[PDB]
Symmetry: C3
């Protein structure tokens, strides 16, 4: 439905987003598998093995929207390629963090990657305003010249 | 990488989202600090964070729907109010229903606006096509 | 703020998202009413399980809609919500559903996105193939 130009600005971000979706499903798969090691309803408490996978998942899930926000913020406002690479790095950290709970690491992981993607977005927004104000200064500059050189055209 | 014109339609929204990211970092940090030192104080901070995390993707959804389909300024302003109400809740240990509703209504209003402009464009096109055919033999 | 043409490519995705927001509010309301117990644990777990999966759903819904085709994506998203309703009420006897629901819908929206990306690269390479083809003739048929 969308044009070829704007999809080229998101394609790398979309690929890394799709990889994270596969990863999320893998995490969910691990939880469900560990849930059926117990034998009728789904509970959020259980054996030590289940509680470690469930909590690990819970941490990964709690940080997903934030990661998704900064990834796309960095990719669209600043630059796509670096943001997508840092996005991939976050996924590799998640993978090692999630398996790291399988005997424990802390509640938060990949703080610096979130920070880096956040910084890019700040730089991108500042880069947006710099180009906007330069555009309005160029517009005012041409408008001032036009009124000044106006009678000289007649 | 995107053009100047589209980025100007999402910039106010993106700032609010980034501030919410810092606030999410703050909430997660406050939980992390209490996790290192089960506890009666830990359960209050964990639940508060969990209550914010559970509502966050819904908020992010209505903020961006209202901003893109309706008007950016009121949506971003309401989004900033949500992060203020969110902040006060984390001190006292569902919040901001009325804000979520306001953004939801903005989106629906923006959607209704889209269709009005679409059908008007359809009406205008059909009207010009109707005159064009009946007038064609005259030239 | 966005132009009519681009908003036209996201309307159905927006509507679905908005219905899902209503459903999230319903689930959250069902939790708050129960919080004034086993009845509370089940509603909380059902909502939590739904919430956990929601951003993954929202990601593939829009990816599918934007990259592949809006109508099939929006309808599949709508199907996801019906399944999500049966799943939530299924927690509300000693037996409940598992942790995962609507995974085949997620898979379908995923595969749409992949297909939409492969569609992008096909037109792009064809666009460079055309560009390179024109440049070859423009050099050959030139000194005339
Ligand atoms: C509710 C959601 C979070 C969710 C949960 C589980 C999911 C999916 C989506 C998907 S769809 C996706 C692969 C993510 C595009 C699948 C994979 C399929 C082939 C459909 C399957 O095994 O049933 N699983 C199980 C699975 C995922 C990843 C690994 Cl590594 C192995 C098995
Ligand atoms: C899981 C995720 C959502 C997350 C969690 C914690 C995070 C970050 C990201 C970030 S990066 C961000 C500030 C969100 C752009 C930081 C801050 C940094 C500078 C990296 C640090 O101190 O380690 N913290 C700790 C922190 C944040 C905010 C306050 Cl008020 C105090 C401490
Ligand atoms: C945390 C977040 C996801 C959330 C949670 C609860 C929410 C809302 C938003 C909204 S806003 C929305 C309905 C989504 C437009 C409402 C409805 C209102 C009218 C504001 C109310 O009763 O307070 N509730 C309660 C409610 C929602 C849906 C049903 Cl079916 C019945 C009651």
């Amino acid at each position: 439905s969308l044009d070829q130009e704007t999809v080229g600005n998101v394609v790398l971000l979309a690929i890394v987003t799709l990889i994270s979706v596969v990863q999320n499903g893998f995490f969910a798969h691990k939880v469900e598998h560990e849930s059926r090691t117990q034998n009728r309803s789904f509970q959020r408490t259980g054996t030590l093995a289940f509680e470690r996978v469930y909590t690990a998942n819970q941490n990964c899930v709690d940080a997903y929207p934030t990661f998704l926000a900064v990834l796309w913020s960095a990719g669209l406002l600043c630059s796509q390629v670096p943001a997508a690479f840092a996005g991939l790095m976050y996924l590799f950290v998640r993978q090692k963090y999630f398996v790291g709970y399988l005997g424990t690491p802390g509640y938060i992981f990949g703080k610096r990657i979130i920070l880096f993607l956040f910084l890019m977005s700040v730089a991108g927004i500042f880069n947006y305003y710099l180009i906007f104000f330069f555009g309005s200064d160029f517009e005012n500059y041409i408008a001032t010249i036009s009124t000044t050189i106006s009678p000289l055209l007649l």
